[PDB]
From a paper:
GH43 enzymes cleave glycosidic bonds with inversion of the anomeric configuration. Therefore, based on these functional and structural observations, XacGH43_1 can be defined as a GH43 non-reducing-end xylose-releasing exo-oligoxylanase.
The structure of the free enzyme shows a glycerol molecule occupying the −1 subsite. The Ca2+ ion is coordinated by the His288 Nε2 atom and by six water molecules in a pentagonal bipyramidal coordination geometry. The catalytic triad, inferred from structural comparisons with other members of subfamily GH43_115,17, is not interacting with the calcium ion directly. All structures show that the active site is clearly blocked at the negative subsites, having only the highly conserved −1 subsite, which supports the exo mode of action, with the recognition of the non-reducing ends of the substrate.
Numbering used by the authors: 10 to 49, 60 to 344
Amino acid sequence: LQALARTAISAPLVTHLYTADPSAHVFDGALYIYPSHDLDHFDMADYHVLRMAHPGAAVEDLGQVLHVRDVPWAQRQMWAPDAAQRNGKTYLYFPAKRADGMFQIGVAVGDRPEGPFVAEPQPIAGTYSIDPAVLADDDGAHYLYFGGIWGGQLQHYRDNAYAQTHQEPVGDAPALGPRVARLHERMIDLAEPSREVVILDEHGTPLRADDHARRFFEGPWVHQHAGRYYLSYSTGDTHRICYATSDSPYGPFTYQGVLLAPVVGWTTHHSICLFQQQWYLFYHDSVLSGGQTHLRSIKMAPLAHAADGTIATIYPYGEDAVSPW
Ligand SMILES: [Ca+2]
């Protein structure tokens, strides 16, 4: 697979550290990226913030802005984060693991996009599992999406309650979807208990647990375009970013297709962000590290919505490349 490094459509945004799970936002007139920081096993411990001043600019590492040692409730595994702004504050949302082994989502508050961020002493009540994404709705509301199965533990929850015997559904049972909750105006609490986000097939039927090509695995992201909501996410063991659409941030979302073909390294994770004239897909892969799943680099590619609202598949090493998966 050494050909893939040669025909990659994107270079690593930074190479002096390993980065993953990019959440891109335009805050205060610039592009800010909030990724995970892979350490040279997914044992990440801290977050950096990166910035691009304008379209085409060199990427700045603004340095470390939060470390798990400053998060009283969390012991380890600072995974895919996100950020939001409200009332002149910037909020850093992040999944991390408690000493008792459970993932939950917490938040840290700062006065600027680049921090420093001060972590709340407890996680956000009502959250669990991983991969937060916070949608700043055009109407002023903020919504928190989250969830990931397998290592993300979402499969142990139903209706927001944990049980040891809750497992991943199988067969004809509906696959699990991400969770969503409107955030409180104070941003560090939910305004409501989270709800299931339902993803439907083209016939209006919820996706099956045994449909691993399409069913939700982790890393939800929502963006607005042309009066609809786009939910996009990783399918995990089939290595796709897929997307689905709805007239509501709550769904249900109807499956549309594959947004990003498989990348090098087992995980795939992304965000979609509008910057000046252009939509961009931010994603990651493991080429920098020579194909090591746990050492990634974030990347970006331009993204286009078609007249009919669809998004064409992005092929990270070219459409003619041998797929890494
Ligand atoms: Ca994410």
